[PDB]
Amino acid sequence: HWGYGKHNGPEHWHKDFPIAKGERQSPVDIDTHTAKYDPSLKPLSVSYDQATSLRILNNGHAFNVEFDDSQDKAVLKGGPLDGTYRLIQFHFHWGSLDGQGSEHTVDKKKYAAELHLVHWNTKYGDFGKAVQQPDGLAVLGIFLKVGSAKPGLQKVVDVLDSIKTKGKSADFTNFDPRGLLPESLDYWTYPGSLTTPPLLECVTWIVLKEPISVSSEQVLKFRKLNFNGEGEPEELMVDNWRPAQPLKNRQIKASF
Numbered sequence: 277h278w279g280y281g282k283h284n285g286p287e288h289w290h291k292d293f294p295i296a297k298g299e300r301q302s303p304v305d306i307d308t309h310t311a312k313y314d315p316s317l318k319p320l321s322v323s324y325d326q327a328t329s330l331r332i333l334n335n336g337h338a339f340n341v342e343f344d345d346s347q348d349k350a351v352l353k354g355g356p357l358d359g360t361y362r363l364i365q366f367h368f369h370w371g372s373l374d375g376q377g378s379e380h381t382v383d384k385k386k387y388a389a390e391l392h393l394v395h396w397n398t399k400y401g402d403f404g405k406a407v408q409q410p411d412g413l414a415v416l417g418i419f420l421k422v423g424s425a426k427p428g429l430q431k432v433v434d435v436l437d438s439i440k441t442k443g444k445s446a447d448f449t450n451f452d453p454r455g456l457l458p459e460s461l462d463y464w465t466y467p468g469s470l471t472t473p474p475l476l477e478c479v480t481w482i483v484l485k486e487p488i489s490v491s492s493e494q495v496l497k498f499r500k501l502n503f504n505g506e507g508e509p510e511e512l513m514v515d516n517w518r519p520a521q522p523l524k525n526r527q528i529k530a531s532f
């Protein structure tokens with residue numbers, strides 16, 4: 277099945293998932309000089325105070341921190357969005373080296389990692405129905421650079437020993453995603469897709485301009501994760517990113 281290697285990687289995905297070559301695929305390069313400030317974007321609203329994390333899963337391509345989305349507790353609204361989108365999970369993409377890892381690029385610049393906070397449009401009832409809709413998902417993308425440690429990331433870094441291999445999961449209640457945001461909520465927005473198979477073009481992408489910085493020793497522990505399952509040849513979890521895809525007519529809007 278699909279992966280990130282020479283034989284199952286992003287350039288093989290189209291065979292099984294033809295939308296790989298579609299009209300609104302992600303990620304893309306954010307040309308800062310082509311992006312246009314949009315006066316009609318309302319302010320962004322990130323309400324993560326009542327957030328109920330539940331568990332962390334190594335799913336063999338990344339790790340997911342999952343939230344109880346049965347109520348409006350952690351939500352995105354405002355900005356390019358109409359109505360309410362609930363937080364279901366977050367996860368990251370990162371590299372083997374600091375000079376690569378992000379999925380979106382800013383003027384062809386690759387950051388060391390990329391955080392995705394995934395939300396679904398409540399008027400669709402569940403996550404599964406929202407992924408069948410062009411306005412179904414809203415993803416908040418946040419870049420990571422290496423520098424000083426990110427305090428709000430450390431509880432995640434500490435649990436990764438317990439989820440080394442594909443299929444393992446640990447209990448991860450009372451985690452606050454507020455600790456993963458940068459200071460500023462400036463953002464580029466565009467219409468797009470899931471960046472992993474099945475690559476559904478159901479996403480409103482909100483990519484923040486200001487990266488968070490993380491320690492070298494925080495990313496190092498990300499890099500110790502395995503793609504494989506327990507008792508298999510060790511395959512390190514690195515370079516789990518899709519490269520930038522063609523923009524194709526689409527327009528990236530700036531909030532600032």
Ligand SMILES: Cc1cc(C)[n+](CCc2c[nH]cn2)c(C)c1
Nearest residue numbers: 394404407470471472473474475
């Ligand atoms: C990065 C990413 C995040 C999520 C929630 N998903 C799940 C989407 C999905 C498709 N069919 C059922 N769920 C995928 C495939 C990728």
Ligand SMILES: [Hg+2]
Nearest residue numbers: 409410477478
């Ligand atoms: Hg869709």
Ligand SMILES: [Zn+2]
Nearest residue numbers: 367369392471
């Ligand atoms: Zn992602």
